[PDB]
Structure formats: C-alpha cells, structure tokens
C-alpha cells in the first residue's frame, strides 16, 4: 500500500496546488538527491 503517514490521504482534493510545478516539492525535478536516506534508516526505529 505504502502510506508512510497516509500520503494518499483523507480524500477531499481541491485540485488546488500550484499551476505549473504545483510546487512539486522543493527543487524536486523528481525525488533524486535524497532517496538513499529512507527505507533502510528508519527500519530500525520504525514508528
């Protein structure tokens, strides 16, 4: 499923982000420089 903090969350959706980038998440061309943190790290303190 994958809802680490339910990311496909409570369904209201005003389709109301930014127009262009929708503010695509801080210089997120994708989810490039950052991916090597998660999965592993938190798998020994899972909350």
Curated annotation (Swiss-Prot):
Q: What does the entry list as the binding residues for Ca(2+) 3? A: 8, 17, 27, 30
Annotated Ca(2+) 6 binding sites: 36, 40
The entry's Mg(2+) 2-binding residues are 26, 30
Which positions in this protein are listed as binding Ca(2+) 1? 1, 7, 17, 21
Residues annotated as binding Ca(2+) 2 are 2, 7-8, 17, 27
**Top-level lineage group:** Eukaryota
Which residues are involved in binding Mg(2+) 1?
15, 20
Q: Where does Ca(2+) 4 bind?
A: 15, 20
Q: What residues does the Gla domain cover?
A: 1-46
Tell me the residue numbers annotated for binding Mg(2+) 3: 36, 40
Amino-acid positions noted as binding Ca(2+) 5 in the UniProt annotation, renumbered to this chain: 26, 30
Residues found modified as 4-carboxyglutamate: 7-8, 15, 17, 20-21, 26-27, 30, 33, 36, 40
Name of the molecule in the record: Coagulation factor IXa light chain
State the species of origin: Homo sapiens
Q: State the taxonomy lineage.
A: Eukaryota, Metazoa, Chordata, Craniata, Vertebrata
User: What fragment of the full-length protein is this?
Assistant: 47 to 93 of 461
């Amino acid at each position: 499923y994958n809802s680490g903090k339910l990311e496909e969350f409570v369904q209201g959706n005003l389709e109301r982000e930014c127009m262009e980038e929708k503010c695509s998440f801080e210089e997120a061309r994708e989810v490039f420089e950052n991916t090597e943190r998660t999965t592993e790290f938190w798998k020994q303190y899972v909350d």
